[PDB]
Amino acid sequence: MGGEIITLQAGQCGNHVGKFLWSQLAKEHAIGTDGLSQLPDSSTERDDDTKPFFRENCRNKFTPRAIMMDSEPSVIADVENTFRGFFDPRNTWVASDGASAGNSWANGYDIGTRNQDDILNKIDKEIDSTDNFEGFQLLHSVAGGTGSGLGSNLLEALCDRYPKKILTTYSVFPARSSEVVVQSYNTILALRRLIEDSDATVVFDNASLLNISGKVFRNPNIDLQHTNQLISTIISSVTNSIRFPSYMYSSMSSIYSTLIPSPELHFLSPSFTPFTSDYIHDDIAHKCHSSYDVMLDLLDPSNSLVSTAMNNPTYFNVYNTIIGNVEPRQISRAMTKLQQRIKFPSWSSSAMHVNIGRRSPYLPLQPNENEVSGMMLSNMSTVVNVFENACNTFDKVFAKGAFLNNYNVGDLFQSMQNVQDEFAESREVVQSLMEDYVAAEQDSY
């Protein structure tokens, strides 16, 4: 019910962010660290505990509907913890046939091919328990060996096998600069598959994400583990409309259907205000409905730089505003009329409005508060710049001729990496095209 989702967790990051996600859903839905229900009435269908992210055993110990692929470390940490039993050791695949990704996409893509069937068995088992499948979410990092290669391989297969379902990926991007040049190889080979085979991709730009971690959390001992807590709060907020269908103007599937302008543009950027504590002092920062409303419009806390936080001269394809916490509705409408009129986003010659907002309340299983929060998820045409950069890096690397040997065995890449050349032309046609849509030529008769 509500249309089920399967999460695929690839690489270190996905598995880490996935463990945190589960603790957060488990608390919120008043269930155990083994999914065991809360014994007095804590849930009498006041909420519908999300069968999309859960499956029910008949001990009624809720289990997450998730497939983990990585090697041993991340899975081990969960298994040590009392978080096991909100795990499934069958969903868990640990490489013992990986034998070093090496920070090479090809190597990852290729190990994935080799163990396609055992992997496909975990996925098919998970598919078979499904009622009616909404779609998939892929959690991963790009510029990885693992995070890159194995995720891309899976995505292209999923695309062909089930062509009637939604594929979303939550992708960590590196930066709009490089210190490591072969980032660009990993990212360009992966990118082809992500552009075509994903119908939506949510970009988290790691430079930007780092700024939030450094500035907000302010701990000098900070790492990725610490940062992953910021990705999990963000990912969980986007899911509010599925997990709570009891909001009768927010329901995820129909929302997804509308917002998407076509999968041609589908790199999305989040922004969020304010922040909840996870590694720092409590949120005691309360401010007005008007204050709340102003803050959503600023992208000054940049959690992603896909070039929508540098500048806005092209146009926004769609904007969706996620409100969490009930607060006077009448006021919410009077401010909202001012926002549509004011026209904060930039616009093309035929699109001058297409910005939406949804409002949902907090659950009371959480300690009650009268602080408001919200998330922005938006699609902008500015993304093309990241491709432009990628092309600069791509020319640079290809110019050295770094490591062509591994590529040459492969039929595709015999005359050196042909796939990357094919991609270079393909990406330029798309980037030109997105510019035409900002301009008059989008409707012409």
Binding site: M1, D41, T44, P245, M248, Y249, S251, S254
Partner: protein, 106 residues
Amino acid sequence: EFSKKYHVLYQSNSYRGISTNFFEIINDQYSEIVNHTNQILNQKFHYRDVVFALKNILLMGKSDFMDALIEKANDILATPSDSLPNYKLTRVLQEAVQLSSLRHLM
């Protein structure tokens, strides 16, 4: 109620036609009775729950169910109506309730 009968009978017992006192006794009974009647409606026969439900069904704020009713029904409605559709639609209605995830726990 029986005490109340006794009370009316009490003003009548030494009567002087004092309506304000007679009303006072009556006013106390009214307030208590409306408050007990709220417990009787709300608690016993889920009134607070019924209004919320009405809002869900009649103003159709129960979007999960509706999407489902429409998916199952669509085929049948497309075909002109007869006597038998009514049974399937009711079955689809029953299925829709299950689909909307509404269930007894208290």
